[PDB]
Amino acid sequence: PLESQYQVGPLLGSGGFGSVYSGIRVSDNLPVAIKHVEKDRISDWGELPNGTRVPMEVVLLKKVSSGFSGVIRLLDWFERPDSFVLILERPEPVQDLFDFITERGALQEELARSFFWQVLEAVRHCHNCGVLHRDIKDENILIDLNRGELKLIDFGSGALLKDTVYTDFDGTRVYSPPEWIRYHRYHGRSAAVWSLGILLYDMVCGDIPFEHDEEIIGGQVFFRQRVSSECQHLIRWCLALRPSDRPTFEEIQNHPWMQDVLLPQETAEIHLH
């Protein structure tokens, strides 16, 4: 029972991730997002403890969807003959962070601090659950505009977290670290931290720092906007060319720029309402 269980609304969008629709659960009018992806387009597969063959995204989402977190939770999923369908939480009202930055331009540091901190907490949650997202970027972050909470989306390029080297990467190129560009090798946490430096820069400057491969591996960070020296210092540490020179998640959250973060609700009151 799929169409009996969900009222399908308009298409929100489509791309490499599949096709995503607005929907509501009929049993209680809960807003949902309904994501369709063709089996032909799924390269990465896993299986459920009970021996069922599902896309890796379902395995990863099940792992992170227990309890409250800054991750959009998987509520349900269906197999069809030629596709899988995912039922996901939908905040309302909602705007993705790419859109928000496009509309508002570069964020005030107070807002970027709150947003960055919530992304850090969500990524820590994922890593605690054994999951690597591998496509952290503004487009994969939803803002709940009334509650001021950020939520991570799109685990379709993720992997189980391991301590050994990754040699595959189907995430967003310009959020990809210099060691991937140069060697097709990265480790999970240090690459994630690179993607976080790219994201923080994006928030405070209003655009990503590097366009082409040559800039990524040169790793020279130029600021287009006025940015505090403490925030510049954190960004530059995250974007260290050597992965071992990058900060741990703890070191980021203990950085001076990260102190005195606003709560979600006060973030929404001051900056979103």
Are 121 and 234 members of one domain?
Answer: yes
In terms of domains, do 119 and 53 share one? no
> Which strands make up the sheet holding 6-15, listed edge to edge?
6-15, 18-25, 31-38, 83-89, 74-79
User: Domain boundary at 77, 92, 107, which?
Assistant: 92
Q: How many distinct structural domains can be found in the chain?
A: 2
> Are 24 and 88 part of one and the same domain?
yes
State yes or no: 162 annotated in a binding site. Answer: no
Residue 40: which CATH number?
3.30.200.20
- SS3 (DSSP) at 186: strand
CA 50 – CA 47 distance, rounded (Å): 8
Residue 19 labelled as part of a binding site: yes
- Domain identity same for 112 and 241: yes
Q: Which one-letter amino acid corresponds to residue 37?
A: V
Residue from 135, 138, 144, 154 carrying the catalytic annotation? 135
The annotation status of 14 as a binding-site residue, yes or no, is: yes
HSE-up of 24 (CA within 13 Å, CB side)?
8
Question: How far apart are the C-alpha atoms of 182 and 161, rounded to whole Å?
Answer: 22
Q: Please state, in angstroms and rounded to a whole number, the distance separating the CA atoms of residues 263 and 268.
A: 9
17 and 38 co-located in one domain: yes
CB 172 within 8 A of CB 138: no
CATH number at residue 168: 1.10.510.10
Q: Where are the beta strands (DSSP E) in the chain?
A: 6-15, 18-25, 31-38, 45-48, 52-55, 74-79, 83-89, 94-96, 131-132, 141-144, 149-152, 159-160
Is residue 188 part of an annotated ligand binding site? no
Phi, psi of 265 (to 5 degrees): -65, -45
The answer on 133 and 85 residing in a single domain is: no
Domain enclosing residue 73, as ranges: 1-92
> 216 by DSSP, 3-state: which?
helix
Question: Annotated binding residue at 219?
Answer: no
C-beta separation of 212 from 234 below 8 A? no
Phi/psi for 7 (5° steps) reads -85, 115
Residues 202, 67, single domain; the answer is: no
- Crossing angle for the helix pair 188-205 and 229-238, nearest 10 degrees? 150
At a CB cut-off of 8 Å and minimum separation 6, what does 209 contact?
A: 198, 201, 202, 215, 221, 222, 239
Q: Are 83 and 110 within one domain? A: no
Do 108 and 77 fall within a single domain? no
Q: In the structure encoding, which two tokens stand for residue 205, read together? A: 């400057």
Instruction: Answer with the one of 58, 92, 126 that is the final residue of a domain.
Output: 92
Mark whether 15 and 114 lie in a shared domain.
Answer: no
Resolution, in Å, please? Answer: 2.0
Indicate if 99 belongs to the active site.
no
- Whether residues 142 and 242 fall in one domain: yes
Angle in degrees, 0-180, between the axes of helices 188-205 and 109-128, rounded to the nearest 10: 160
What is the Rg, in whole angstroms, of the alpha carbon atoms belonging to the chain? 19
Tell me, what amino acid is at 89? E
Q: Could you tell me if 185 and 213 lie in one domain? A: yes
- For tokens 């097709």, the residue is 184
Could you say which of 44, 71, 92 is where a domain stops?
92
Closest of 56, 196, 206, 233 to residue 121, by C-alpha: 196
Name the residue type at position 165: V
The answer to whether 67 is annotated as binding is no
